[PDB]
Amino acid sequence: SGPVPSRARVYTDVNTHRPREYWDYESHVVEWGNQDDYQLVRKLGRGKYSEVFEAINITNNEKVVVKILKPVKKKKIKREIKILENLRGGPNIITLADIVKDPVSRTPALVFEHVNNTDFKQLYQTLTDYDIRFYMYEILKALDYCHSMGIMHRDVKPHNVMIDHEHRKLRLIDWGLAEFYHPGQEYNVRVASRYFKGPELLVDYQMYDYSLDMWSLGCMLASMIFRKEPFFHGHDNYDQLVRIAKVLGTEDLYDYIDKYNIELDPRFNDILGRHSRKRWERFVHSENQHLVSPEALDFLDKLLRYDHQSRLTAREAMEHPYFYTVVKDQ
Ligand SMILES: O=S(=O)(NCCCCCNCc1ccc(-c2ccccc2)c(Cl)c1)c1cccc2cnccc12
Secondary structure (H helix, E strand, C coil): CCCCCCCCCCCCCCCCCHHHHCCCCCHHHCEECCCHEEEEEEEEEEECCCEEEEECCCCCCCCEEEEEEEECHHHHHHHHHHHHHHHHHCEECCCCEEEEEECCCCCEEEEECCCCCCCCCHHHCCHHHHHHHHHHHHHHHHHHHHHCCCCEECCHHHEEEEEEHHCEEEECCCCCEEECCCCCCCCCCCCCCHEEEEEEECCCCCCCHHHHHHHHHHHHHHHHHHHCCCCCCCCCCHHHHHHHHHCCCCCHHHHHHHHHHHCCCCHHHHCCCCCCCHHHHHCCCCCCCHHHHHHHHHHHHHCCCHHHHHHHHHHHCCCCCCHHHHHCCC
């Protein structure tokens, strides 16, 4: 027979207890606002599934951001809208202001709150140890919130974290890949950027949960404290697991596969080989040492586990010694 089932350790049944309409996004009816309320100012960026503009709401002269969606199935747009509405007002979640349609293109556009996000090239050369702890804590507040609300982000990465450094403000954006957690549900593993994919995705284990986000977060943390972006630099999805195995070791990987009775693609049998679990010390050097602490390494170790069940929860992560200074401030 097949893979062993799995349940989230936390927030397992939060959706089952909510009215169906909370999570049953196929039933959601979108209220479209008026495109004529917004005038586009400049293009900010492009993504797989959208073009992003700065715009002005001419009703009230507010700066806003418009995300014009490339063609996607109605149900995927409904999912993102429902999730954004459910999460609206939660800590460090992007605020969806409005939803409009071009009545000639028929293209849908999401309208967001404007966040003054800070030069990408620039700020990186200045991140102190404190800054990294602080912003990691801010991301964890967003993740604990969305997890507690029954939602997996499933695409946590630097591109999806806006920082307004002047205001010490952070927002988690791009909820287009997020999904509701239901115990027993088999999810699509073809999510997330290669470098941030959890082992569960790479081995095709479908019964995953919130803990996916914690792997992605660990990848981010490693890249920041070690000044190595990306940390796990695979050539493709197969090689991505090999890069992980060269760090975490193959013994624990095969233990995970055994525990869940996962059927490993035969492609992997050739290429995984045999690798020791490496000490984190091999990534420390004179340039990055100011970012690296016993605390940082202990925390990182507890995010980056093959076994999704063994990873810290968001709320556990927030209680780690890595954050004691930040917590004492607030
Ligand atoms: O296309 S966009 O204009 N631009 C996407 C945002 C840029 C992402 C920049 N990443 C910053 C970042 C993050 C974390 C980090 C970092 C910090 C601490 C620890 C580890 C890593 C570090 Cl070091 C850097 C856009 C797209 C969609 C919605 C938008 C809504 N309102 C404005 C812009 C929007």
